[PDB]
Assembly symmetry: none
Homo-oligomer: 262 residues x 4
């Protein structure tokens, strides 16, 4: 009757162990459409110079995004797209910058809520997927004496579970740039719950595929049932890295989020 088409500023957030590089196919697809796209490496990820053992919480890990948001011009708002564990970065960020956020998009992602502890979807995730195959774990003691478990994701888990359907060039790349990462689960467990006026108020779009071999369908559906998103988009096929296996489809869904909220 009236048709709307909106250009938007997406801030793309990788999951633990990965970096901005995972968005190297979706960032151009989005810019072809005329959007502005920022893909940030979080602390100790991608080519960020910090080492994970110098990071003490998922909040500290989130520093690049929060600094970025501190610096957005007055009146500018972004759509934050986070994959896998980056839903926690979107919740940390929305409790600090709710007015700079047009919508949070969870892409095969943790969907934190305000009712339970910050670590709650992490517990549920680990319950749904308790074997990380060839992943190696390590520990360090943080600034207040908490022991932090880090992981070096194994190559079979990478091949089969996270990058199932990706090309060999994309699977080799992941192996060439993957870093250690941590869920910081135990400090998230001690963390104040996400707020209703910050995080609880942002618009939330949930993109997922039932072919995801690490954030499995029963888990994903549990999260959707646990904290109803404003909108759900299920992509058929692909794998956990839909920004690699369904790049264009994800860019078309993201155009729709920009039209509704940006």
């Amino acid at each position: 009757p009236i048709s709307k088409m909106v250009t938007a500023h997406f801030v793309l957030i990788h999951t633990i162990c990965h970096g901005a590089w995972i968005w190297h196919k979706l960032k151009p697809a989005l810019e072809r459409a005329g959007h502005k796209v920022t893909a940030l490496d979080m602390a100790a990820s991608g080519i960020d110079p910090r080492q994970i053992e110098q990071i003490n919480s998922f909040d500290e890990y989130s520093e690049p995004l929060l600094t970025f948001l501190e610096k957005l011009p007055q009146g500018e708002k972004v759509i934050i797209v986070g994959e896998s564990c980056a839903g926690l970065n979107i919740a940390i960020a929305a409790d600090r910058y709710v007015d700079k956020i047009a919508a949070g998009v969870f892409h095969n992602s943790l969907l934190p809520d305000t009712v339970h502890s910050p670590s709650y979807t992490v517990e549920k995730l680990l319950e749904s997927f308790p074997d990380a195959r060839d992943t190696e774990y390590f520990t360090f003691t943080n600034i207040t004496g908490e022991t932090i478990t880090t992981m070096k994701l194994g190559f079979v888990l990478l091949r089969e579970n996270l990058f199932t359907k990706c090309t060999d060039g994309e699977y080799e790349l992941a192996k060439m740039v993957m870093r250690k990462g941590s869920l910081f689960q135990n400090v998230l467990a001690q963390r104040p719950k996400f707020t209703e006026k910050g995080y609880g108020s942002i618009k939330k779009v949930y993109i997922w595929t039932d072919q995801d071999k690490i954030f499995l369908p029963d888990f994903q559906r549990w999260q959707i049932a646990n904290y109803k998103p404003d909108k759900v988009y299920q992509v058929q096929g692909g794998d956990h890295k839909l920004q690699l296996t369904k790049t264009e489809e994800v860019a078309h869904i993201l155009q729709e989020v920009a039209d509704a909220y940006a």
Copy 2:
């Protein structure tokens, strides 16, 4: 058809990632492929200000080679400035090297100092366009110049013909780097027994927009390779724009030198 163990070496500011298309292609032919991050490159944790020479920058390669089991030999493939990593490596581990392959690369010699081809490259291409430079003093007091490669330079000169996904990946993981030109200017020349003796295969395209055809042609005249393969078209990053063509030449190098 011989299967070989190839060790792929990226150029300054880049990392093992630049080989993410060529490593699976080689492996489809049954080759073993090792792709290393040099010091302060790709996801190596060291920062460029702690590296004091091009030989210290080469450490991942020299450690690798130090540990290769007895009787094993590798073909080292080096792009752009990595021709200097092949020559440093060949002088220390000549018996472990079946051949060196220069992929749009510097081709050092034994007659001039180690910085000679770096001098000539800068003469052929003196404007790095939007590249930024920085300096630090190394542990011995020498001033080292680092660069952060400009994105117009990346787009138009290095990744000229690359896809947008590839160029974008380049911007996302590019690190600072250094020619260590002045320490190379002070370094002993590469030896005739080490580097001078290895087999040398030169791969290039005249469509390369940073290692320009007359510099490449001067290099070949200055120190004639055992073989020169020229790929038509593509750009400076032939392992991305002509991946199967370089995998095929590299099969010819495994056949010839094992």
Copy 3:
């Protein structure tokens, strides 16, 4: 008389060498003594420009403590700025620490930021005489100030009463160092459960010519120790000028806290 395991921690720019008289004295009483070089100090191979905070500088202590066998506790003895290494350590490993001993040292608290006693020290002693300063940008962009301690300052203020052999040794192995003042200014305060809970013994002399008696007295009033021992005379380096007096106080600390 209790034998204890003492971990001795030097101040910025110095190294484990400053304890070369006190380590044998303690061992004559059957104590176990570990004396560590902090990052970029004594013969540690790292350079100060690669260290980005006082917590990274503390790494040798935190690794040590990370590996102490279960059920073992240590008395950490820290001189001058090493009071900050004790507080960082006590927050991460409170159960491994029988007591902290401040030897003419900064005595951080929990109520103000980690840089508060550094601010007050500089206020009490703002002229470092012939000390030189340098800066570098750390990995996060903060400007770090380093110093090379001047020899008149070493002779007259730090090693005032020391023998000529000792002062000369100091000049021969002194390294650059940093207060990382501004990163400490940004650091979370020391916790009441970690650092706030440990036993704290303060050793000093009013003849100290860099940590002057009114700053030391302000520290004790600002955060009253469990015990304060005052040694008459000597100088700032009591582990060199009053070695047996500090070994004797430290026997009293092993007796009291094990």
Copy 4:
């Protein structure tokens, strides 16, 4: 009839694994006498920032001394005092700066000659003392493919053989600052012989004690017999570190060298 007393500029050179710090008692004793004293750390020794694996020859190891000598004012000459393996640093230096050297003093030191290979007294030394007790060895490959053996001197060998009679404060200090070191024997073996006009022409004073428990009396006497020094001074007692156990005696001998040659 006429009595002479001379003030001189001594350049003190430590042995491999040690640093300028070993001279911390003799440097003040000499300055009490009015001499000028330089004590240098050689490459990868004392607090020199270079690591031994970046050093490729005893010549490269000798860089601090040669740079120093390049910089001496015209007409200035020094007496170089070298302990244990530092006789090779004195020979490397005298072939480059013979006119800046008033005399070489070998203090329980290797006494290189011009007739045999540079590595020859190193072979003889290792033959006289073949067991380095708890010393650990390591290897790296140098800039031309030679394998270099390095050593971390063991603590018993330090206690009993090198620092036999030193105080506990001096023995603990050595342990606190000792570094890896290398004889570079195999590259010395390939090295051109020291020259007769450089090294063969400098005055050479040999200080030693027969109580030295690592450069043993039969070895020392072999060296004295092998290449007759211009003057020999035998200190009674002490140990291998005579600059620590006989500091004043060594300073009085060194006053005599300054009167004869400086």
